[PDB]
Amino acid sequence: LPNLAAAYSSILSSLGENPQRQGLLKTPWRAASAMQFFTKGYQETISHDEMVIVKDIDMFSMCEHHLVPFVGKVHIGYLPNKQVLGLSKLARIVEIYSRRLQVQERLTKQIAVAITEALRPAGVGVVVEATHMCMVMRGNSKTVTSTMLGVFREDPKTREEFLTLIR
Amino acid sequence: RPRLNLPNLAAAYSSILSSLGENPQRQGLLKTPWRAASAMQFFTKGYQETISDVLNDAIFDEDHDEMVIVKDIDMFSMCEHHLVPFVGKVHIGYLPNKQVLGLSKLARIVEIYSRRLQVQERLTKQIAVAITEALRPAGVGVVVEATHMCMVNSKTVTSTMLGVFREDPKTREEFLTLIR
Amino acid sequence: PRSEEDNELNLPNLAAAYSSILSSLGENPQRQGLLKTPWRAASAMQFFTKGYQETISDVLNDAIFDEDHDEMVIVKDIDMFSMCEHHLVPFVGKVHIGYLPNKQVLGLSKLARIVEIYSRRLQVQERLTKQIAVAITEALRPAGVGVVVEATHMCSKTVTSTMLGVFREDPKTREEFLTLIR
Amino acid sequence: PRSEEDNELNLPNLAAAYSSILSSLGENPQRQGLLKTPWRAASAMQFFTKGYQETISDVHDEMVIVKDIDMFSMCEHHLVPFVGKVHIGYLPNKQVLGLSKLARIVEIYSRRLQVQERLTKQIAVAITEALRPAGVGVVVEATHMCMVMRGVSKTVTSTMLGVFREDPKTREEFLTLIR
Amino acid sequence: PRSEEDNELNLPNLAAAYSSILSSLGENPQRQGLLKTPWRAASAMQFFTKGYQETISDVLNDAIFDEDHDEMVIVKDIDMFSMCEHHLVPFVGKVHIGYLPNKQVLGLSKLARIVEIYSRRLQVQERLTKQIAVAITEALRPAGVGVVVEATHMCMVMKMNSKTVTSTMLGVFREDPKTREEFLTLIR
Amino acid sequence: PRSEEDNELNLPNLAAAYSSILSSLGENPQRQGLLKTPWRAASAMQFFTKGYQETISDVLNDAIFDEDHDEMVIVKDIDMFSMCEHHLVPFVGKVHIGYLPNKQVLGLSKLARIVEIYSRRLQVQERLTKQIAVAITEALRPAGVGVVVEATHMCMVMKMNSKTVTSTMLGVFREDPKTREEFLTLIR
Amino acid sequence: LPNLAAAYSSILSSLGENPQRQGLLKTPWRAASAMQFFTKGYQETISHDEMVIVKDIDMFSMCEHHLVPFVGKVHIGYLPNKQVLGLSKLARIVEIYSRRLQVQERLTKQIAVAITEALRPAGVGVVVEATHMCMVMRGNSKTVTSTMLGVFREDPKTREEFLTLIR
Amino acid sequence: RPRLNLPNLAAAYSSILSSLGENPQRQGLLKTPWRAASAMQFFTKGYQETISDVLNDAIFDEDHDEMVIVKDIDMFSMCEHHLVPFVGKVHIGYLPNKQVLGLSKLARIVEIYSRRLQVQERLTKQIAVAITEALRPAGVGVVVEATHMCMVNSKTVTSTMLGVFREDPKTREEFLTLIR
Amino acid sequence: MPYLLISTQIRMEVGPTMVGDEQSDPELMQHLGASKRRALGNNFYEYYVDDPPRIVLDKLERRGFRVLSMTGVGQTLVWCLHKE
Amino acid sequence: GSHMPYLLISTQIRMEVGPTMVGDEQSDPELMQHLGASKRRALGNNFYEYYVDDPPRIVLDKLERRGFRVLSMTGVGQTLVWCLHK
Amino acid sequence: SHMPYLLISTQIRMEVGPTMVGDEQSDPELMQHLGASKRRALGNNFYEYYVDDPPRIVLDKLERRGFRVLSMTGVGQTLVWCLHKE
Amino acid sequence: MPYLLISTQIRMEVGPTMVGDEQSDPELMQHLGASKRRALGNNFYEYYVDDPPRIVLDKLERRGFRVLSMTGVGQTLVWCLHKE
Amino acid sequence: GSHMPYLLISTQIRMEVGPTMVGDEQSDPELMQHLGASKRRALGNNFYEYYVDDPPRIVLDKLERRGFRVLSMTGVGQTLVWCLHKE
Ligand SMILES: Nc1nc2nc(SCc3ccc(F)cc3)[nH]c2c(=O)[nH]1
Ligand SMILES: Nc1nc2nc(SCc3ccc(F)cc3)[nH]c2c(=O)[nH]1
Ligand SMILES: Nc1nc2nc(SCc3ccc(F)cc3)[nH]c2c(=O)[nH]1
Ligand SMILES: Nc1nc2nc(SCc3ccc(F)cc3)[nH]c2c(=O)[nH]1
Ligand SMILES: Nc1nc2nc(SCc3ccc(F)cc3)[nH]c2c(=O)[nH]1
Ligand SMILES: Nc1nc2nc(SCc3ccc(F)cc3)[nH]c2c(=O)[nH]1
Ligand SMILES: Nc1nc2nc(SCc3ccc(F)cc3)[nH]c2c(=O)[nH]1
Ligand SMILES: Nc1nc2nc(SCc3ccc(F)cc3)[nH]c2c(=O)[nH]1
Ligand code: NA
Ligand code: NA
Ligand code: NA
Ligand code: NA
Ligand code: NA
Ligand SMILES: [Zn+2]
Ligand SMILES: [Zn+2]
Ligand SMILES: [Zn+2]
Ligand SMILES: [Zn+2]
Ligand SMILES: [Zn+2]
Ligand SMILES: [Zn+2]
Ligand SMILES: [Zn+2]
Ligand SMILES: [Zn+2]
């Protein structure tokens, strides 16, 4: 934490700003605590015959290339074999991987792999839709990444069903 | 005076990468100290400009008795408390007296103040004050709508109404209807 | 099934438990706003679980019609209010039902009555979706059934989907149902 | 305020009441899906009322608005949730509130057994007393489950104080900007 | 006013300037896609400025009708295409016109013809808005006129989401709050 | 490629041609609003064609990442501003790009930089669409690429409501019905 | 009718079309009967304390200048004094005046005048929204005409209420 | 041969005014015989053009392997049964072989056939046949959506799918998704 | 008949000026050059003149009237006169 | 001076037509009877009022004969109010 | 004269109170005579004196204290009277 | 010509002040330094001065006028003066 | 009569509280000083004004002691305006 605050104080000076003015006095510490909270996922470990979908799961992540947030939604689908996952646990999986320095592609894969390994289902579908500040604050575009595994990859009926139902 | 420091910024971002528990040497993190430093310089490039520079070839003497609005101006700023972006839109309206401003210059005004470490309230005021002082118009309306990433669905709306935009109910209603 | 006699008999026990809950939460059960709450919460929880007082056979009374139609029949946007069996907090939304009849059709309102008896119980969305589809399949022996439940859980949206018979097998049938339920 | 010790102490009494409710409804509290329900329902009801653990003390000439603040509250009449959004506006005199602090005001009062009217008033009164501004506007929009799980609709409550009450231009501006 | 003879005479000079521009940009004016460009760009720029060929007097020939109508008349969503006089890039959008007549009404299509004469020139949105309102006020002497222009300027987009709205309110549209509110509600 | 020296050298020739156009149209190049127009129009036309100053090689410097990702990657609603090569009037809209990688992924911003190099030229929408798809296919050798451009042509509007959509589907986006359907659903 | 069919047959010849081809043989009679139906209004004669509104009344009329249709909707509002008008009669008033060669301004006035004279109310509001083919088939624009009488003209609260409720 | 008659048209419209029971001499009806005649000539100006005239400077030899669509082309036609307009939109798509058509020329094709006394089915076919014959493409899709004033809310949609637009499910699905 | 009410809408520089109701003195209305009408949407008759209110006020002064009060209500300027 | 010296009367625009509000619950009943006024509690109001069908000019002339004079006239919303004194 | 001016007000409807009769610096004896109470209404950063009576009753009381209405006006939904010791 | 109507829009501290209509006394208009114009959108001429109303009121007092009434109507402050 | 006979003062509602606007740029500086007024050009205005923190009732009593009398009081928008005169 003090090393993070020292680096943020250095950034405040290098930008041409006065780190002694009222509004900036506590900024080195607030920015350091914020960056620790945005990466709190490094503190955690991953340890019926119907399509189950949890859509519009809010997602907040940090771009590893520019250290600017990318925010959006995750839509998850799966066709269980024997065991089903508790609805709140799907969002907890989203949380562990998104609260880290990421690239949307790796984040999407990590969620799908975690669900596939926890349940061994007939299929999984993971779609992430996000706005990257590293692209917006530079110059309306959205990034969509999609992982389709098992029957979600193989069966056209299954994939079409998932994609229609997540709208 | 308005705004060498790029290596100092890159060094601080490299330090941050290490302090977070991340390995700065992995493929995806190798050029990050420089990319984050260039991004933070671009986000604060408003400190490199003055309101006088923006007003070059911007004023036109004209007999226009009409409300002039530039709405949905994209706005990207940086929270001065947490160094996390706040993004949204600015809607500006004014009723000229004897001078009009080039339409693109209104956006350039938004750009100079928003590209800094800010609080939405100060940003809103700075835009309205710059227009008021550049043109001495009968009235000004500035509305900023933004999402603050430090809060991580809720939106903040700040609104400055000056001159006839404050005093005349017809003028304020007209501006607020036309910006929708 | 649960009877109206069981309800009258258990209403004071339910009210007593809700009065206990108000006290255990740190609240004052004697203030104006909470005075009648033990009884109102008890009557509400009985109404939310009123599905236990009805059987699928009662629903099927005057519900079946012998018809030769050969068309997809859909009832969409059926309001659904259920109770989460894990936390006792509501999950609410909509059910969309489709079927391709063989020789029998159901009265359109009876499809809603099926959603009613299963959703008005302590439930998990997956079991609720299956119970509706199984009840329609067993009552009509149709060529296929599609059941889609979309709900918000008070404890993001959960969508569960059962595709049976030709709704599972035929890509044209499944696509038609999913397009028409928009 | 309610303490975390009070919560630990009352959790078994809450679980016992929820186990009683499961048996009084005609259900089987011993079946797999209902076994942990008395303790999950008790912990959920404590979380829904965590605002009793807080006190308000612990937490420019322009209109300041924070709109679409998510709100979850509990009906005190029926013990079923009412959920929606809060839109807050104010015209400061000499002191302003930190943007996150008003979400914290909505949180303390909404996470309790409530009636929407009292909740709307409590938020407006807290902002008015904390800041003593020229005016405040508080609009709450909610769906009540005790009205939807029985035949029928949204409830909108609106408190307008100071210049938000007196000036037609101010009130119109706030109502337009919260859309 | 500009005549069709002036157009024929200046077409080769316009094509020559566009051929010069193609060369000065680093492009090959001999490639398939650029071959006729000097002439197509010149004819397009003449069409975009065809408003200089018309007068407000000829546009209003038998456009006036003497009638006893006490009602607000609005023509909304009139497509508008103009050219920025500063950058020579288009600005495009819509015009919404309202008026409260007294002794005379204008043919509904003639209001669009007024938008055409002024927009088909090298313009600034503020001047265009005023010219339309002044032409209606002078042609009819009404109790009031409202003119609202909404446009996207390509010299501002090339920021991208921004629109320019200009609004002229005269007579009772300026003075009466009920009249102005009615017009602004009915155009949306 | 075009250099900044070529731009400085040709700026007066561009301004001279724009001054000539102002005179040939029947306008007064001495009025307040037209005074600096020859220079502003010339600088604008240079900016609109800045893509001739870049190469696909420099745009893709350290844009490639070797990764084992088996997922569809899409960047949708990329704002696009181009210039019609036939009429010298803008065509504007959006680009939606999709690809299924194998051994390499491209930095998300680099896909937009590819749209920039080709769109900032005198173009036809069909060529622009192909150039973007070919650049992605050659830079990554992926299993498939999809490129959809949606635009409004000012030389068609000046009919007014019409949009042009061009679509390139390569590799698995062409061959697999599930892949193509997935991309088309996810971009809307 | 035969005089109308003779004129339509003449128009078919003057346009450069063959009035003897299969698709055009019955056109002089069909166009004549259509034009009589479009002007059937010439065959007819006009002979509580709450705001009453009937909105989205479909309207089909004929431009008197170009003989091309103008179509849209009528929204009517009134504040009764003593007597109220049957809901279906408001649409019958719309029908008599719209089924004629018209100008939207005259049509709007005729409806408002008919309601004012039939009920003597505290106020009437009539708004007509229409697309004119004489303007569309030449080169998105809509014409809106609005008559506000009595308290709908005088009271800002009343006029605002009517205009909000017709949306 | 493709398309003097204006006074004959005005005389017929003057006759119609009288036969309807209306007084042709009132202020609003005075210039109507000429305005209606000029309008009916403009609505049928498609008889003055040939498909060959439209194809001047329209063809481009190019190696483009992509679907080309021009959607929301405004369309105004006249019903040949009642002489009342039918209006709407045309959406065209094609997959070129070795030649592409200038984007505006697709709209000019719609214009020549729709500006005539028509039936929507014939109009749809004429547009598709003209594109097929001008370019010999791998496939064509033409969708016309219109409101018929003779019927006085219901819409008529006609759709022609040729070549690969008819045969390939992927091609037809792509066209139908992209025209929305 | 000691009291008189007259009015005009903004702008005050221009008429019409309303100078009476159905029960107004017909001789005074005739003197002012007023006409009687029932405007569309009204269920009452009124007397009006084309003159702006300043001209009507001067005429009423010559008839022995004096302005007691002037007020705005909506867009209407109203004068209350008393015969002195 | 006099017993009950002030009087407030009002009308909504148009001023040429009634009703004219001439009193509250505590108004002088004899003066209300003289004006031909009726007492009512209009729906939505939590108070009684006295009103007449006459336009305000007629009420003003009657009040003049009772010794009242107009001190002030004002507009508030759509209401014209007269303040009279005896 | 000492404290010659007085401002009083009521919202529409004029037939009913409350009537605002003073600010923090108002004469306490006159406020007591009118039966007024002092309060700081929620949303206001000032104290006011008010009575439940409609303005006609307050006007008659002020007349007996030597005050005369100089002017009456409307502002928004408020009717205001300006009185002077006369 | 005993009556006079003058006006200003809010804010009252600043002009223009409207001081007359087409039929106003030209000598009084000249005395006030007024100019005649037909503002765009108006179908009537008006006389106005740049002065705020307090200055016009003092000038009218020296011409024998006295304010009888002052009122607001929309955004306009109007004064009714009489030659007394 | 007197030099500078008319005076315009104003307040926004609520009337119980100030500021009270008491003058324009050309106002008598001695009277402004007597009222304890300050001169400012509020942001958005292209003119100077004199104002006091006092509610209008207090300013009216002060003006009475200077020989002014209220001739008229009116509302305009949210503003209460008083027109005063001195002989
Ligand atoms: N709703 C819904 N339910 C579904 N259940 C299935 S089992 C298919 C299967 C396919 C291949 C295989 F080797 C084993 C099992 N598929 C479904 C579907 O596509 N939709
Ligand atoms: N569109 C539009 N145009 C407008 N022009 C104005 S000038 C105000 C003004 C100027 C000078 C003056 F003395 C009094 C009032 N106000 C407008 C408005 O509210 N809308
Ligand atoms: N509308 C509509 N009607 C339908 N009727 C049937 S008969 C069953 C059947 C049997 C074999 C087979 F291969 C496909 C379908 N299926 C329908 C359908 O999918 N849609
Ligand atoms: N945007 C916006 N800004 C605004 N500032 C005000 S200050 C009113 C006021 C407050 C206190 C006082 F003593 C005098 C005037 N009102 C505003 C408004 O309605 N909108
Ligand atoms: N629809 C509509 N019609 C209107 N006609 C007028 S005439 C000016 C005027 C004259 C007399 C009067 F009592 C009120 C208004 N104003 C209108 C308006 O604002 N809207
Ligand atoms: N989301 C998404 N991911 C995808 N990855 C592929 S690899 C080609 C392939 C390989 C093996 C296989 F069995 C099926 C498809 N295709 C995809 C796709 O169409 N969508
Ligand atoms: N809903 C609704 N009902 C309403 N009833 C009225 S009676 C007004 C009135 C106003 C002036 C007058 F001379 C006589 C009567 N006004 C209403 C309104 O504006 N809305
Ligand atoms: N975007 C898009 N481009 C496409 N190009 C084609 S070539 C068809 C073809 C050509 C030759 C052949 F031997 C077999 C198939 N089909 C496409 C498509 O469906 N969509
Ligand atoms: Na007037
Ligand atoms: Na009245
Ligand atoms: Na009151
Ligand atoms: Na003024
Ligand atoms: Na005040
Ligand atoms: Zn990035
Ligand atoms: Zn922050
Ligand atoms: Zn649960
Ligand atoms: Zn409840
Ligand atoms: Zn420009
Ligand atoms: Zn082109
Ligand atoms: Zn027409
Ligand atoms: Zn037909």
Side-chain angles (χ1 to χ4, degrees), chain C residues 2 10 17-18 21-22 24-25 27 31 33-34 37 40 45 48-49 52 81 85-88 122 154, chain D residues 2 10 13 17 22 24-25 27 31 33-34 37 40-41 45 52 72 76-77 80 113 118 148-149:
Chain C
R2 173 220 272 182
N10 283 297
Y18 280 116
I21 288 157
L22 297 173
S24 308
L25 292 166
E27 260 281 13
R31 67 177 177 91
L34 296 175
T37 298
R40 293 181 294 218
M45 183 58 68
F48 300 149
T49 67
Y52 299 127
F81 322 100
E85 73 170 24
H86 301 142
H87 304 95
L88 305 179
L122 303 184
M154 302 289 131
Chain D
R2 193 171 87 181
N10 284 297
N13 298 163
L22 292 183
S24 307
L25 291 167
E27 259 282 11
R31 65 168 178 98
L34 290 190
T37 294
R40 290 180 293 217
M45 183 56 66
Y52 296 120
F72 184 115
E76 67 182 27
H77 294 150
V80 278
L113 301 188
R118 187 157 65 244
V148 153
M149 312 167 67

Side-chain angles (χ1 to χ4, degrees), chain A residues 126-127 145-150 152-154 159 163, chain F residues 69-73 99-101 143 172-173 176-183 186:
Chain A
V126 179
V127 175
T145 48
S146 173
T147 296
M148 298 289 176
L149 304 173
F152 280 55
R153 171 84 59 88
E154 304 277 337
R159 202 192 301 180
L163 295 170
Chain F
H69 287 140
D70 182 15
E71 53 190 278
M72 182 179 292
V73 182
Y99 77 101
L100 267 163
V172 301
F173 282 58
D176 192 332
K178 306 179 300 298
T179 309
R180 200 191 304 179
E181 204 154 6
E182 175 181 0
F183 170 58
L186 294 178

Side-chain angles (χ1 to χ4, degrees), chain E residues 27 31 37 52 85-86, chain F residues 27 31 37 40 52 85-86:
Chain E
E27 260 280 10
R31 65 179 180 94
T37 295
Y52 299 123
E85 71 187 19
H86 301 144
Chain F
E27 260 280 10
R31 65 179 180 94
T37 295
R40 293 180 293 222
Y52 299 123
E85 71 187 19
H86 301 144

